């Protein structure tokens, strides 16, 4: 696709049959989702934005389908105000900025 | 150009004859620069991100060149972790996300 930036670039993502809407975010190193109890080992982590840091759980090798594209990688879970697809997964699906 | 996302999308911008590095950030509605002096009036403003809300100074109709592409719009200045080019100016330079 080509996604313009007049509005927030929100897309539908699937994680294990739970389907949520996430922001395609070139400003984010990592991918961060709100509220979900996903499987496997997790490690505490602190991630920073405007305003300061939040504590999240880091899960590795997690499948996520983004607009029909298969992504697998590190997913952080914590009290993010919006779900965010970061560069770790944007790269996997071939996403670029173009102007 | 086309910018891939294996690394942070940091580009050189020119504002007030000053060169700075800024992050092309599709996750930001607005453009936020680290503390600097800009002319004209400004309006106090509050914005939020992953770790809450900050105070910034809002300057309107400010010219900025991003990778040579000219924009004129709103620029917020305050305690951002990094200089951030947001959707308000990304749209002006014709920037889209593509995959």
């Amino acid at each position: 696709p080509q996604i313009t930036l007049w509005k927030r670039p929100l897309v539908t993502i699937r994680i294990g049959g739970q389907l949520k809407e996430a922001l395609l975010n070139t400003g984010a190193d990592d991918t961060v989702l709100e509220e979900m109890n996903l499987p496997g080992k997790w490690k505490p982590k602190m991630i920073g934005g405007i305003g300061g840091f939040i504590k999240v759980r880091q899960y590795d090798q997690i499948p996520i389908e983004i607009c029909g594209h298969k992504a697998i990688g590190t997913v952080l879970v914590g009290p993010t105000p919006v779900n965010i697809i970061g560069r770790n997964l944007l790269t996997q699906i071939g996403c670029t900025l173009n102007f | 150009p086309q910018i891939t996302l294996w690394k942070r999308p940091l580009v050189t911008i020119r504002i007030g004859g000053q060169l700075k590095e800024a992050l092309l950030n599709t996750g930001a509605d607005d453009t936020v620069l680290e503390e600097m002096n800009l002319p004209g009036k400004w309006k106090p403003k509050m914005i939020g991100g992953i770790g809450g809300f900050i105070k910034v100074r809002q300057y309107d109709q400010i010219p900025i060149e991003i990778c040579g592409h000219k924009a004129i719009g709103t620029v917020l200045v305050g305690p951002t972790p990094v200089n951030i080019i947001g959707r308000n100016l990304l749209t002006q330079i014709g920037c889209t996300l593509n995959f």
């Binding site: 984010a28 920073g48 | 509605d29 936020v32 403003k45 991100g49 951030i84």
Partner: peptide, 8 residues
Amino acid sequence: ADIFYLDG
């Protein structure tokens, strides 16, 4: 007024 920069 929402800016989701994230430094992991």
